[model samples]
Target: GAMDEKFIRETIETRIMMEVFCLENYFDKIAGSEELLEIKGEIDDVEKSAKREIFDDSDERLHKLFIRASGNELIISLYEKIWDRIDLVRHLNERYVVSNREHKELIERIISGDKEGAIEKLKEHLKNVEAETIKNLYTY
Candidate 1:
């Protein structure tokens, strides 16, 4: 069997890529105008906040909203499953940030309708999270 780190890495890789895929496919048309503006506004708010102190729940909800706006039922289902696993990791009490610069970059890329760029940024963000989680796995 694999270690916890393996599970964490694999899970996050799948989850993060799924999210990036959904966004890449939908971000260009997820909302008409108002909702898109709201999403961007929220993203700006988060980025304007203290980077080191930002929590992901707010952004998570926003991302889910965008995904729902995509009208993709399956992506919503994937989102729920991913968040459940993320919560399980949180319960382990491993020290990690809920948000990071990479997340900001990802959102910005989506806002700009840069699908390929978002995909690349998200993969890097996922890897970074896995590294952080694995490194901190034993500290708790």
Candidate 2:
């Protein structure tokens, strides 16, 4: 069976909610930790390599790092449950180049302790990806 647009929208919505919540609530913990720099390095590598597959993997890891940094096992488990669907939407969305730029800015904002800025960038990034994925769903 083919995937439905509603399902795609729901998946992205869920992701936006969880990810934004984590960033808003755990900004200090995430920003203070070394993991943020590590992910930044990985993102830089992906950007340098310019490989879609690698960028996709880095993208997932970056978001997952945000959730994991929350230190809430239950929320992390919930995110895991929807991991596959989120990944599917990612694959359908062909915005790696734009996404890479957004991701870099998002991380920079986070590292600089710009909570509102980071969250704003994140929302924009997710919404853009959601639109792209939904548009591609029909083409795929």
Candidate 3:
């Protein structure tokens, strides 16, 4: 059962943005966690790996790290609510360089304690990701 493509894409996009927003809100709180540090390093490796033909462990782990940072019931719930429908791996593979660059920016901001920078970049990154994924989906 296919829903309207636009609605489906937008709904998933909204959820992506919301998840990033919530993660941003909790950015500083997770600054002290070693898990955040590991997440940071993992993303750095992802960036270094550059364009990958397939989604691997890093893909899911990165999102898990973001979710771990938030630990907010509502945000996590909403994210889990729409997680499966979103073509996260497809997006990552399609725009590998772009995606990794944005992720690196966000990770650095988070690691350096640039809350505002991280928040802003995360919102923008998610929007760009959403747009590309939607375009790719419809074109398919």
Give the TM-score of each candidate: 0.70, 0.94, 0.74
lDDT (Cα, tens digit) per residue for candidate 1, span 54-111: 3455446555665676677887787786776765554443333344455556667767
Candidate numbers sorted by lDDT from highest down: 2, 3, 1
Model 2 TM-score relative to the real fold: 0.94
In model 2, which residue pairs have backbone atoms overlapping below 3 Å? none
RMSD in angstroms, all models?
3.8, 1.3, 3.0
| Clashing residue pairs, backbone N/CA/C < 3 A, model 3 | none
What TM-score number comes out for model 3? 0.74
Report RMSD for candidate 2.
1.3
Give lDDT tens digits, candidate 2, residues 48-96: 7788877887798889988998889999999999898888778887778
Give the Å shift of residue 133 in candidate 3. Answer: 1.4
How far off is residue 121 in model 2, in Å? 0.5
Off by over 4 Å in 1: 1-3, 30-54, 90-98
Candidate number of the best TM-score: 2
